[PDB]
Amino acid sequence: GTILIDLSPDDKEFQSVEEEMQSTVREHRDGGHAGGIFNRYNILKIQKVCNKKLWERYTHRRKEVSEENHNHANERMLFHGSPFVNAIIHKGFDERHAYIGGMFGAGIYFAENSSKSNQYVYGIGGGTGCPVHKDRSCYICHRQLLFCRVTLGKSFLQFSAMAHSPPGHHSVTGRPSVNGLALAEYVIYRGEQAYPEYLITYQIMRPE
Ligand SMILES: C[C@@]1(c2ccc(-c3nc4ccccc4c(=O)[nH]3)cc2)NC(=O)NC1=O
Numbered sequence: 001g002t003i004l005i006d007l008s009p010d011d012k013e014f015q016s017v018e019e020e021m022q023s024t025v026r027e028h029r030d031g032g033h034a035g036g037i038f039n040r041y042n043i044l045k046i047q048k049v050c051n052k053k054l055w056e057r058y059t060h061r062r063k064e065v066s067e068e069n070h071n072h073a074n075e076r077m078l079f080h081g082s083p084f085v086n087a088i089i090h091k092g093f094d095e096r097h098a099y100i101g102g103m104f105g106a107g108i109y110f111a112e113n114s115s116k117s118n119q120y121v122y123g124i125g126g127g128t129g130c131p132v133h134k135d136r137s138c139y140i141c142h143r144q145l146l147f148c149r150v151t152l153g154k155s156f157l158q159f160s161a162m163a164h165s166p167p168g169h170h171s172v173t174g175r176p177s178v179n180g181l182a183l184a185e186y187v188i189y190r191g192e193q194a195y196p197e198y199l200i201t202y203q204i205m206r207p208e
């Protein structure tokens with residue numbers, strides 16, 4: 001049931017998604033090991049992901065969360081990197097998309113920094129890099145991220161350097177507590193609390 005609609009680069013919606021992608025790049029404490037060395041991306045395509053059933057599954061869960069949290073879904077737009085983006089956009093998020101060993105427990109993880117989600121496009125720690133060159137810093141191969149609508153509801157705040165969310169909460173917020181430049185990361189424990197709204201195809205760019 002999924003169809004993908006291409007956005008034109010002249011569309012303000014393409015432009016606002018591209019800007020969130022580019023402006024949330026940061027340096028990583030691994031010096032680029034997982035995700036590659038880059039300061040910006042070459043955006044190749046942005047497609048809107050349209051699936052009525054997945055959308056309705058999302059909004060149904062959003063209303064439940066909202067009603068458990070003084071009518072506040074606490075909805076964000078966040079990045080997700082995964083080897084399974086193609087399954088996600090067709091079938092939705094479920095437990096096979098979870099990071100069992102994540103620092104905040106077995107759930108599905110999202111980032112404010114696009115460059116953080118980039119480190120997972122080829123797997124945990126960037127795996128063995130791109131399929132074609134086995135290069136975690138490949139500048140040639142096309143990568144994809146999702147820019148997702150995520151319901152956080154009442155989020156458990158963890159300060160720091162599938163399971164259940166903590167009792168009385170709908171998600172966990174991993175607040176960065178050492179690296180002053182890192183943005184927050186978030187975990188949900190129900191696939192129905194995220195909708196994969198944009199599929200972004202891109203290359204990382206070699207710095208000049
Ligand atoms: C499905 C998978 C997976 C997928 C995505 C991520 C992921 N982890 C994150 C952790 C922090 C912030 C963003 C992300 C993010 O965008 N993606 C971690 C593990 N779990 C797994 O064991 N291997 C995987 O590739």
Ligand SMILES: [Zn+2]
Nearest residue numbers: 130133138141
């Ligand atoms: Zn490659």
